[PDB]
Design a protein around this ligand. Sequence first.
Ligand SMILES: [Ca+2]
Length: 781
Amino acid sequence: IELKWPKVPEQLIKGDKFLKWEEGSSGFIEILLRVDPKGYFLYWKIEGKEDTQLLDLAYVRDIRCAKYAKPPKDKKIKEAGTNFGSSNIPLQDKCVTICHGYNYIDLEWTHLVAENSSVAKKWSEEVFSYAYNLLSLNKNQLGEWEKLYFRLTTVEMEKNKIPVKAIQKCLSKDKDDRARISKALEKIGWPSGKNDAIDLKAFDFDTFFKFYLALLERSEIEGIFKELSKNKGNITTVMFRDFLNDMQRHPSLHKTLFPLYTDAQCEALINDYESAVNKKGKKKGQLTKEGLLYFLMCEENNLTPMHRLDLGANMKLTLAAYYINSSHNTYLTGHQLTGKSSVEIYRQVLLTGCRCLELDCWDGKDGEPIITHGFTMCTEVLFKDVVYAIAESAFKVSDYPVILSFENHCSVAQQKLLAQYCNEAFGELLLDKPIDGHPLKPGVPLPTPYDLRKKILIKNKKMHGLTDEEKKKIEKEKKDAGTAAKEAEAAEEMSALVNYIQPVHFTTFEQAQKKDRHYEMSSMVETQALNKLKDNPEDFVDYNKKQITRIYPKGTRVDSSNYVPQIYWNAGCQLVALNFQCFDIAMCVNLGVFEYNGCSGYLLKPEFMRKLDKRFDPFTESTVDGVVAGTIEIKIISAQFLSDKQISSYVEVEMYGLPTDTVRKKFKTKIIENNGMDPYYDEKVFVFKKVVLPDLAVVRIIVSEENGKFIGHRVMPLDGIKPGYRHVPLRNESNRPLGLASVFAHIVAKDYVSYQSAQEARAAALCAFEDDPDAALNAAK
Ligand SMILES: [Ca+2]
């Protein structure tokens, strides 16, 4: 595994001097900016401010320097910045710009001037790597506890002392919870008064874990300890080994590729945990209740399968073999008809690892092409600005190829400019010619993502007996397509940039097979794709083994709502385009699944979906030959640190995959009232008895306030899911960590131990994906 934890240079730990300034103010202040030794926070002090200022790198989106930074325009700031460090270094070369946000639509900005260009560059490269570190983003609850520990001992520390005030503010705003915190500090033997402070010497991490033990009532651990110890006293080495190999391990996990734990390893692990919790009170090969809880929260018990998180997939198959992270009308940051267009949104979408973007190009009044949603009240942006934005951000988080979907409405003169600016903005990144071994002839497969690393592909038109019932459906498809229904003819300069991703008019699956052109593809509005899926589902899957389908939402979704992408991934569609600005279930799931494989934006389709000789109906309700069906059981036990106030909460568990495996609005826990710190649900297990196609499915935990307000979630693909007792750190809608907020659950995952037309039956099957499946099903009949 190539993934590494953040490694923070001593230079950044000590810190560097910067001038900090804000838009809309003429002020500036020199700060000493620092990173904690674990790469979790940027922090700095402002003279006269009580609290140390910080940025939680969990929500940092980008950091830019030099030509990509935003230099100050205010006269007084510019003069100060020019004089800061060396005046012989141009102002902009010293500038560093940071953008941060809980989600990527609502950004805030921090602007800095370094003393020189080397410092600006070093900080930009280092901080970006920490913000996008997959291990840091996936750490278990003990890791999040350690993050809090490092905040307290670096950011909040005052003259080698940790103020109690700082401990309380980091955990809760509630009076009762603050009392619990004080009592817990008292129980440990630390000062607990409102205005007291703890010495750094006495504030070690292992004692900080003893504070965790004193604070939360993890009532469930007693019964679980009794279970695993067989009620015989402490958990012995052999009992722990069997726990790890039987309960915490998928029974079908390959025993050579993923070796079983041994006695010697388990004795050693027990020593690790017992050392941390009991020190010389530890007994050889004997794990205590507190030692068990430590394990359950530590990296050894991380729910995330590291071999899947790492960029470990085979990237050397045809492009058609992958699910590719895709954005629709990417320029829009809100409503389809009344919202704003943006340049920065392109950078933000690419930073999630999204690989396929859309650019709706129109003639600008001044002779310069623009991007906007035609015939609406949306604002416009310059095409040139967008492509320079794409060129900046395209390969910052993924090396794998980007596809730009052009919806081209420009005159020939402005299309010349589109082509010109693509060339000038992208340079070498632009794939303007076929590569060796892959000419554009029939029968020649598409290149692999590996072949096309660091390349931008252009999807644009190249140079130029139906029945009445069929013609009417086609008319509806065209209407639902909106502005995409009619583009301009391709100019030769734009045509010239198109090769492997050539959009063509779809006729039939029979015709696509006959032509045998792997570089021809179709971009279908959801209405068209649904007609094909319902008419010829098996043929759709077969088409997608060699050729690419892009899907995009119909025009009636004016609020930028999304379909659930599994609907189309189930048919092997590769470019399932979503509105990234709408954080509905579809986007939550999309960002969840594409975190895996190194956040590359590419996921390899299941083998059965790539086998040319296999026929597969995604509407099947029975087991598929060659694919082992699964059973999943999820028991929601408790949650930790859901909120800084006393909230009432519940937990839901959903599954999305094949229609027959998709379960929404079925499973909901009881409400635990007035407890945001350690609610204990102890809910009866939720059973997903028969999962027909596990590798197309994900299970999802969603935590909400009683009034339905979203708190956090976690998406767990069944491919590689780890069973047993797991802490599940929660994520926000953009799939960034909430922090300490976690659900504790038990997971069973094992092999399953045993209408008037097809179209109508298939439409009914698709009701399972809706926000209210029963109501959708009732409305159809
Ligand atoms: Ca469009």
